[PDB]
Structure formats: C-alpha cells, structure tokens
C-alpha cells in the first residue's frame, strides 16, 4: 500500500447483537431485487452482489445528512433506520458462513482524497463497531489506482485483481465493492456427467459448450418459469437457476420480480427429482452503480452541489460527493463447484432410477442466484445471455 488506512487508529467497542427477523429479511430482499432489475444488462452477462451493495450504502448512510440521508434511507427502505440497519447488518455478517469448501468474500471500502479532508471520528467509530471495513485517505494519483487494485487482489485472494483504470481530478470519494466466492458443490459432478451440447444465446447463435448433468431435489415452478436449487458444501449456500418460459424474455421476466416473489419462489420449490442440465460458465462483471442507485432514489449523493456528507467529515475548498460506486463480482460454475476437475472414482450403483421426475435444461438464457440458505437472500444475482 501507499494510501493510509484510517481505521488503524480506531478500536472497536463491544456492540449489542440484533436478531435477524422477518422485517430485515423482507427489506433486504426488496432492496436486492429492486437493485437487480434497475441494473439488468441488455447485451451481456451480468452479475451483482446486492448484499455487498447494501452494506456499502448502509455504512455510508451514517455519514449523510438532511436530504442525502433521507434519499439513502428511502433507497434502503424507510421503515428500518440506519441505526437499526447497522445493528442488523453487524449480526448478519457476523454469522454469515465462511469456511473451507464454502468461502465467501465481501470486500467493501471507502477511499477519500487526501488534499482538503478531515474525517469524522464518530463516523469511523461506527465503521469499527458495526462494519469492520477499510477506510482510506489517499493522494488519488496513479499510485492510488494501483493501491485500490492491489487491495481487491489482496482481499479476494487473487480472484479479482483490477477494478479501476483511472481517477479523474475532481473525484473525492469512492465506494469500492469486490465480491468473490470459493466453494464446492455438496454433490460434485462426475466426469461421466459432462457433455457437449448447444446453448442457444440471446443473439440466436448456437454455441457448443459443456453441460453438467445431475439429478437435483428442488424444483422451482412458477406461472412464467421453472428451475432448480443446488446446494454447495456444508449446505450454507445454494445455486438457484431460474429458466423463464420460451415465450418470455429474460428482461421481461426480471421486471416481474419482487423481493417477496423471489423469497417465495424459493420457499415454495417442491421437493421432487429434477434432471438438471447446467452449462459451465465463468465471468466477472464490473458496474459503476451511480446510475442504478440514482434510479432508486439516491440522487443528491452523487452531485457536487447538493451532496451532504457532513456527518462523515468536512472539506474546505469543495464539498463531499460520491464520484463512483465501483462494484465488481466474479463467479465460476464448474464441475467441483467453483473450480474445475471432475471426479473419476465412482460407485457404480449410485445411479438410481427416477420416476415422476422433472427436467430443467439450461438450454437458452436464464437467471441465477447464490442464496444464503437460512434466509433465501441473494448474495449474488446474475444472468446468462451468451457463452
């Protein structure tokens, strides 16, 4: 590094835990889906982590005032206060599984420009107590570009190594999100179960790609879609695949979603055998989230001449505003889960004979999520349009 971590100075106080309850689950699903549908990519595969975004906004919300605050409150969900959000999010993150064979990395930080900026020590304390995120002051020159990049490389153990290419002068504040997932399937794919077949992309191109075949146990069935839920190891997380009906586009289908409809869609998956066919895919997605968040109500925060972040620190010869919310995610769906290398030692009697089974072939564009199994909340949410 070369930037200075403002948090080095600060010591966390003990805090009260607030139990996750139905209200927080409802608000977070609502936020996550609203964020998702106001950020759908038309031409390309997308991936976002709504949880990560919510963390970043909730912690920054502590530094907003007046109209900036009100808007951020409205965008997160008015009926839970920032105060309460801090407590809930602390408790949620504290208990969110992260272990071998099921590693989740959420890396959030705020970066401020050195010249003209004195941080609020109260703000920093809130970060230490509830969030434990890194907060930097930096030159905002060439070496801050590499600083930010090395940081995501460090925090995601090399699964994401760049986020930024340039800083424009007049930038004073970035929120950085990087999210990575390193996990095994609960039941990994046998090599015998991997076959070349045809993905029919959004453009009509028929792509020859490897499909992973397995019998799964949970069937999503809705008026306009079908799909399946596939757990990762130690059952903390699951991969959710939703395939919309042929007569309905991905974008149309997404627009029909609500936090409640998403939760319920999973809550109501029927216990039944599914012949699942899931193509391999891996890609990163980087989104400057300004436009999305603005679509969500959060407008003042991004304007040099109205942003009010006075509870986060003063600035003399300007006025603190968010230049970019830089959000980057990476997913890999493969034979072992997140990593390649299909299994060769097999029990010849393991294969049974299914009866009354359903079929999901991810033969064409679909959406997926990675959910925390205990709440059904999307940690990652995405779309596959082409391979």
């Amino acid at each position: 590094v070369q930037a200075a971590n403002l948090m080095d100075r600060i010591k966390a106080n003990p805090v009260s835990e607030k139990n996750i309850d139905e209200k927080f689950i409802y608000n977070t699903a609502d936020f996550s889906i609203e964020l998702f549908k106001n950020s759908i990519d038309d031409k390309e595969n997308s991936l976002i982590s709504p949880l990560s975004a919510m963390l970043a906004l909730a912690m920054t919300a502590n530094g907003a005032d007046n109209e900036t605050l009100a808007q951020m409150e409205k965008a997160l969900g008015k009926d839970i206060s920032i105060e309460d959000l801090n407590k809930y999010l602390y408790t949620y993150m504290k208990k969110l599984p992260n272990e071998e064979k099921s590693k989740l990395t959420i890396a959030n930080s705020i970066w401020f420009k050195e010249n003209d900026f004195m941080p609020s020590k109260d703000f920093l304390q809130i970060i230490a107590d509830y969030y434990k995120a890194d907060i930097f002051k930096a030159a905002f020159d060439s070496s801050t570009v590499s600083d930010i990049n090395n940081w995501v490389k460090s925090k995601t153990n090399g699964m994401i190594d760049k986020i930024l290419n340039k800083i424009d002068p007049e930038d004073v504040m970035y929120l950085i999100n990087a999210v990575a997932f390193d996990a095994e399937w609960e039941t990994v794919y046998e090599k015998a179960s991997v076959h070349e077949d045809i993905f029919t992309d959004v453009y009509g191109n028929r792509q020859k790609v490897e499909f992973m075949n397995s019998e799964e146990n949970l069937y999503i069935e809705e008026e306009n879609a079908i799909g399946f839920v596939k757990p990762y190891a130690k059952n903390h997380y699951s991969f959710v695949a939703i395939l919309p009906d042929e007569n309905i586009s991905v974008n149309e289908y997404i627009k029909t979603l609500t936090g409640q409809k998403f939760i319920d869609l999973i809550k109501n998956a029927k216990i039944t055998l599914v012949r699942a066919s899931l193509p391999k895919f891996k890609y990163e997605y980087t989104i400057k989230m300004n436009e999305t968040l603005e679509s969500l109500g959060m407008t003042d925060a991004f304007l040099p001449d109205k942003a009010d972040f006075s509870k986060l620190g003063k600035s003399d010869i300007g006025n603190l505003y968010i230049s970019e919310v830089l959000h980057k995610t990476f997913i890999s769906v493969d034979e072992l889960g997140t990593k390649a290398g299909a299994v060769t030692s097999v029990d010849i009697t393991a294969a049974g004979i299914p009866v009354n089974f359903k079929t999901v072939k991810l033969n064409r564009p679909f959406i997926f999520a990675i959910i925390d199994n205990s709440t059904n909340l999307p940690i990652f949410i995405g779309t596959v349009l082409s391979l």
Side-chain angles (χ1 to χ4, degrees), residues 54-70:
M54 214 190 59
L55 282 159
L57 301 173
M59 84 179 168
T60 308
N62 292 286
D65 205 355
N66 302 289
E67 208 50 38
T68 304
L69 173 58

Side-chain angles (χ1 to χ4, degrees), residues 300-313 315:
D300 288 28
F302 291 101
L303 314 159
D305 67 342
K306 216 184 162 202
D308 181 358
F309 280 104
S310 65
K311 301 221 228 99
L312 154 154
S315 99

Side-chain angles (χ1 to χ4, degrees), residues 7 10-16 86-87 89-91 94 121-133:
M7 300 305 288
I10 301 291
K11 282 191 203 172
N13 315 308
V15 296
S16 294
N86 296 334
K87 296 154 170 175
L89 280 170
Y90 169 82
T91 309
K94 200 188 172 105
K121 181 106 156 172
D122 285 339
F123 177 72
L124 295 183
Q125 195 58 63
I126 291 168
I127 306 307
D129 296 345
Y130 298 101
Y131 291 94
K132 281 101 153 87

